[PDB]
Amino acid sequence: AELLFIIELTIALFLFCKEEKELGKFILQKVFQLSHTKGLTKRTVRRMLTYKILLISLCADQTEYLSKLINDELLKKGDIFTQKFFATNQGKEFLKRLFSLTESEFYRGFLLGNENFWKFLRKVTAMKEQSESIFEYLNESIKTDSNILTNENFMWVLGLLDEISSMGAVGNHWEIEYKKLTESGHKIDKENPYKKSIELSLKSIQLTSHLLEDNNDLRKNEIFAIIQALAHQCINPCKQISEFAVVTLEQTLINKIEIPTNEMESVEELIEGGLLPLLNSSETQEDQKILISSILTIISNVYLHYLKLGKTSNETFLKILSIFNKFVEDSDIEKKLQQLILDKKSIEKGNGS
Numbered sequence: 001a002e003l004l005f006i007i008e009l010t011i012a013l014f015l016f017c018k019e020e021k022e023l024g025k026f027i028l029q030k031v032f033q034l035s036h037t038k039g040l041t042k043r044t045v046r047r048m049l050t051y052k053i054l055l056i057s058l059c060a061d062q063t064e065y066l067s068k069l070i071n072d073e074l075l076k077k078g079d080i081f082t083q084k085f086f087a088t089n090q091g092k093e094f095l096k097r098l099f100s101l102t103e104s105e106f107y108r109g110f111l112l113g114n115e116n117f118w119k120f121l122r123k124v125t126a127m128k129e130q131s132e133s134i135f136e137y138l139n140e141s142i143k144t145d146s147n148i149l150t151n152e153n154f155m156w157v158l159g160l161l162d163e164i165s166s167m168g169a170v171g172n173h174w175e176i177e178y179k180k181l182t183e184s185g186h187k188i189d190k191e192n193p194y195k196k197s198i199e200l201s202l203k204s205i206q207l208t209s210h211l212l213e214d215n216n217d218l219r220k221n222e223i224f225a226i227i228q229a230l231a232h233q234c235i236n237p238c239k240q241i242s243e244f245a246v247v248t249l250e251q252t253l254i255n256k257i258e259i260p261t262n263e264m265e266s267v268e269e270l271i272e273g274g275l276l277p278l279l280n281s282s283e284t285q286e287d288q289k290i291l292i293s294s295i296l297t298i299i300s301n302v303y304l305h306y307l308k309l310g311k312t313s314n315e316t317f318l319k320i321l322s323i324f325n326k327f328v329e330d331s332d333i334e335k336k337l338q339q340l341i342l343d344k345k346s347i348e349k350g351n352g353s
Contacts, residue, residue, distance in 0.1 A: 003034060004044065007051050014058060024059050031055055032065055045080050049073060050090060053097050060106040067110065074120040087129045095124065099137045103144075112148075118156040125163045135164060135200055139207060142214065149215045154222045158229050161208050165233045165241075168201030172238030179239070202244055205233055209248045213256045220264045224273035226252075231277045234295065237287060246298060253302040259311075267306055267316055274299065275323060282327070293332060296323075300340045307347050317344065 014027055035048050052073075056066050074081065085091055102111050111117065125134050138160065141147050148157055171194050182191060192198070212226045230252065234245035259267060278295050282288060303320060320340075327333040 004047055007031060007034065007048060011051055011055060014055070024055075025062060028055055028059060028062065028065055032068070042080055046085065046090070049080075050094055050097075053094060053101075056107075057097055057101055057104075060104075063107060063110045066101075066107065067114075070114065070117045070120065074123075075116055083127055086124060086127065091130065092133060095130070095133060095137075103141075103147075112150055112153050115156070118153070118160070122156075122160060122163060125160055126167070131164065131167055132196070132200060134160075135204065135207075139203070142207060142211060146215075155225060158208075158211075158222075158225055161204055161211075162229055162232060164204040165201055165229075165236070168197065168204065168233075168241055169236050169238075171197040171201065172236045172241050175238035175240065198240060201241055205230075205241075205244055205248050208233075209252050209256070212252050217258075217263065220269065223264070223270075224276075227270070227273050228277055231274065231295070234298075235281075235291060242294070246294065249298055250301055253298075254305045259306070267311060267313070268319065271299065271303070271316060271319065279323070279326065289330075292327065293336070296327070296333070296336060299323075300336065300343070303340075304343055304347060307344065 010027060010030075014024060017023065031048070031052055035045070035052060052069060056069065086095065101107055121134065124130055138148075138157070174194065175192075178191060182189070208226065208229055212223070230245060230249045234242060234249060236242055236245065253270075257270075258264070259270070264270070278292065282292060285291070299320065303316070321337070324333050324337050
């Protein structure tokens with residue numbers, strides 16, 4: 001109790017204090033040393049944790065203490081950072097303080113390239129009632145110009161959005177159960193007590209789609225990563241997420257895409273990047289067949305859309321034919337091939353005539 005009282009009193013007086021040369025440095029060192037003591041309790045360490053993050057916010061420089069806080073406190077100990085603790089009224093405050101730190105003029109360069117911190121955000125994302133706050137923080141960070149978009153801090157954030165869609169996927173398993181539940185069609189619905197989760201997933205997919213537009217250029221490996229993320233979102237069995245993922249994939253491919261002999265100069269590149277997850281994961285599931293049918297339909301549609309504009313190299317058509325040869329027999333790939341070759345003939349007749 002005395003430790004808590006002294007810490008609160010000194011923090012309050014520092015709040016009343018005005019930009020001392022190192023006084024704040026001394027305060028931070030003392031609070032860190034007091035935190036690293038032995039024994040203590042759960043509430044005590046939690047209160048000193050929030051006091052520590054408040055002090056870090058109040059100070060500007062000295063990133064090393066913040067790095068130690070992130071690493072040791074967030075990643076190592078879990079007996080004090082229960083998943084419910086972040087869900088209490090103080091967990092939201094702590095997360096808000098952390099994110100508001102992430103946008104400060106100081107404490108930004110280290111906070112961006114801070115792999116352990118993004119892993120902590122990954123852990124926080126896998127939570128029922130703390131997901132929407134993280135999603136909102138990511139949404140506002142994306143809306144702000146540049147920010148997260150860097151040479152690094154792309155694969156991790158894409159994985160974070162993928163984990164949001166994975167929460168959507170557990171909702172999709174719920175929806176798989178509810179599909180059979182609603183197949184009767186005899187009783188009053190009162191159904192889907194998960195519009196929060198479903199709409200969160202839809203907004204996540206939209207956020208990824210808009211993220212494909214950000215920064216206006218890239219090394220095309222992260223563009224392939226965006227395509228991969230959209231494909232993995234489309235793998236989701238439930239009809240709602242699958243449908244919105246298909247629609248978003250089609251829209252992103254047709255528009256908001258750069259293929260004017262730019263850094264990336266081959267539609268072959270985009271089709272190969274799209275196909276790699278589809279070919280590698282082919283024949284790995286019972287639903288993999290219908291997934292292949294759907295994604296090949298998407299591929300045919302995007303190929304037709306690209307054919308509509310100015311382009312050449314029907315060797316891309318040869319390559320998709322090779323894909324269909326990798327998907328021989330069954331006759332559904334065969335009938336889709338007949339339909340798409342008819343469509344290609346119609347498009348070529350329309351442009352030539």
